[PDB]
Amino acid sequence: CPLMVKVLDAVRGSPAINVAVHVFRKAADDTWEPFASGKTSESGELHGLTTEEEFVEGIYKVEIDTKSYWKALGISPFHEHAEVVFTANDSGPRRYTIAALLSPYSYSTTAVVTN
Amino acid sequence: CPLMVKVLDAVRGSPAINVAVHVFRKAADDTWEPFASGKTSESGELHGLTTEEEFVEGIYKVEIDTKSYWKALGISPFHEHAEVVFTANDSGPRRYTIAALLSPYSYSTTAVVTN
Amino acid sequence: CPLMVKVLDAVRGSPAINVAVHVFRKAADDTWEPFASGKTSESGELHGLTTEEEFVEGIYKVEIDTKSYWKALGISPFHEHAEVVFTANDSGPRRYTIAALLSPYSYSTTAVVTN
Amino acid sequence: CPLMVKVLDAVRGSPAINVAVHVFRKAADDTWEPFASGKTSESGELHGLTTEEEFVEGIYKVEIDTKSYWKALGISPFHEHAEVVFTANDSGPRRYTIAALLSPYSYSTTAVVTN
Ligand SMILES: COc1cc(/C=C/c2ccc(O)cc2)cc(OC)c1
Numbered sequence: 121c122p123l124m125v126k127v128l129d130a131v132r133g134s135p136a137i138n139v140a141v142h143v144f145r146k147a148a149d150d151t152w153e154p155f156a157s158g159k160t161s162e163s164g165e166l167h168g169l170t171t172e173e174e175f176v177e178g179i180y181k182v183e184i185d186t187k188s189y190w191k192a193l194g195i196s197p198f199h200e201h202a203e204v205v206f207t208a209n210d211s212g213p214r215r216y217t218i219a220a221l222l223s224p225y226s227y228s229t230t231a232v233v234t235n
Numbered sequence: 236c237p238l239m240v241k242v243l244d245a246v247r248g249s250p251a252i253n254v255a256v257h258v259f260r261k262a263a264d265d266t267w268e269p270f271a272s273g274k275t276s277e278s279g280e281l282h283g284l285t286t287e288e289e290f291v292e293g294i295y296k297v298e299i300d301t302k303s304y305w306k307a308l309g310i311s312p313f314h315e316h317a318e319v320v321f322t323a324n325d326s327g328p329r330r331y332t333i334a335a336l337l338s339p340y341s342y343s344t345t346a347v348v349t350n
Numbered sequence: 351c352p353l354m355v356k357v358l359d360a361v362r363g364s365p366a367i368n369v370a371v372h373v374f375r376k377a378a379d380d381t382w383e384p385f386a387s388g389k390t391s392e393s394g395e396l397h398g399l400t401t402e403e404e405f406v407e408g409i410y411k412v413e414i415d416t417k418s419y420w421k422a423l424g425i426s427p428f429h430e431h432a433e434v435v436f437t438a439n440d441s442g443p444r445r446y447t448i449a450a451l452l453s454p455y456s457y458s459t460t461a462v463v464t465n
Numbered sequence: 466c467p468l469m470v471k472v473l474d475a476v477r478g479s480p481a482i483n484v485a486v487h488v489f490r491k492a493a494d495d496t497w498e499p500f501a502s503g504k505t506s507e508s509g510e511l512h513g514l515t516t517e518e519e520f521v522e523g524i525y526k527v528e529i530d531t532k533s534y535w536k537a538l539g540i541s542p543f544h545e546h547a548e549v550v551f552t553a554n555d556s557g558p559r560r561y562t563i564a565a566l567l568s569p570y571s572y573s574t575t576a577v578v579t580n
Contacts, residue, residue, distance in 0.1 A: 246570065435546060
């Protein structure tokens with residue numbers, strides 16, 4: 121799988137488990153079309169979102185449903201979600217890991233792009 | 236201003252200057268409507284986007300045009316932009332500072348909310 | 351001041367107030383010697399640690415006492431402190447802002463260096 | 466192994482490979498004693514630092530040699546290194562992952578503590 125999402129919780133020092141993640145791809149008319157989705161595992165990871173065949177060059181949006189995550193833990197958060205928007209390019213390496221570190225009023229994200 | 240945006244460059248260790256910022260607000264029909272825009276100053280700050288009168292309750296999206304920033308510096312970065320989505324003023328009027336720290340393959344953002 | 355420290359709390363979305371900060375400077379014998387200390391204000395800022403005259407070339411360590419901060423708020427955090435170590439003024443005198451963003455199991459830090 | 470270190474590069478969007486990491490444990494006389502060390506792998510990870518038998522409760526310091534890493538890449542960095550200082554507690558879960566995200570003028574670190 122060429123696309124993986126990993127989510128960490130900076131308050132508890134743990135994987136962020138059971139977080140909903142929605143991936144979109146931008147359509148010709150400039151709208152976001154649903155592409156893949158799931159919930160993070162006990163390791164904070166979401167695998168199997170797509171295949172090499174389906175993950176063509178394009179503009180993608182990964183939406184991590186952070187507000188619902190903080191609410192489930194009884195903590196008041198700021199963001200509705202975290203959105204990571206990027207162009208997938210075949211020149212670049214094959215595997216994209218989108219990592220996100222969550223706090224109630226802050227998030228960080230990085231891309232780890234490897235072969 | 237009840238809404239301020241501050242952007243730092245983690246590669247240079249400097250304010251991120253001349254970064255375009257676009258703010259949108261969700262309309263009743265759930266579409267994003269333009270609300271305000273501007274560019275960061277030599278201090279990395281963008282003041283004067285709105286007024287207490289105009290900054291009513293709503294769901295807002297602050298997009299920071301990070302790709303345009305990096306490309307102007309000869310870096311082909313990963314993200315298209317950094318996008319901060321939040322409900323504002325739902326518990327009464329507040330002052331919001333959206334701070335962002337940029338690297339070519341990573342960003343963070345935090346909100347500082349005061350009375 | 352040529353050296354300023356600013357600290358934010360990523361859980362509350364606020365300045366981190368009353369955070370103790372200790373600055374050390376390496377001596378010729380490679381031991382850390384006390385250089386300056388203070389506490390962050392209601393704005394999360396600590397000004398006036400030193401002067402241009404006293405802030406000579408050297409290797410400095412800014413320790414931010416994050417454990418004491420969190421414990422005062424009922425959180426048992428992971429780190430003892432956040433420690434920022436750098437050479438200063440080696441390319442001529444500069445102004446340094448050390449910014450830190452705190453969560454109970456995570457911190458970040460960035461330097462903004464200006465003329 | 467109850468202690469693992471993972472290091473990422475926020476400029477290249479890659480694991481930070483061949484980074485020296487030194488771990489210390491605080492001695493009774495309040496000095497730092499060498500405990501374990503290594504260099505990160507091609508995956509940015511350093512495994513096998515210690516065993517459960519040797520990793521007793523105590524205060525530990527993980528020092529990630531970031532300056533040497535940036536110099537090897539021809540980039541001018543700010544920090545001498547990144548230091549992560551923490552108390553290991555047997556009440557807490559068994560496995561400590563120290564993760565660090567590096568930029569030339571900024572670093573972030575989080576602890577992921579799991580069973
Ligand atoms: C296996 O542990 C990991 C930790 C991390 C940590 C990421 C992170 C991102 C932003 C930050 O501010 C701090 C850490 C990323 C990973 O990507 C495969 C794996």
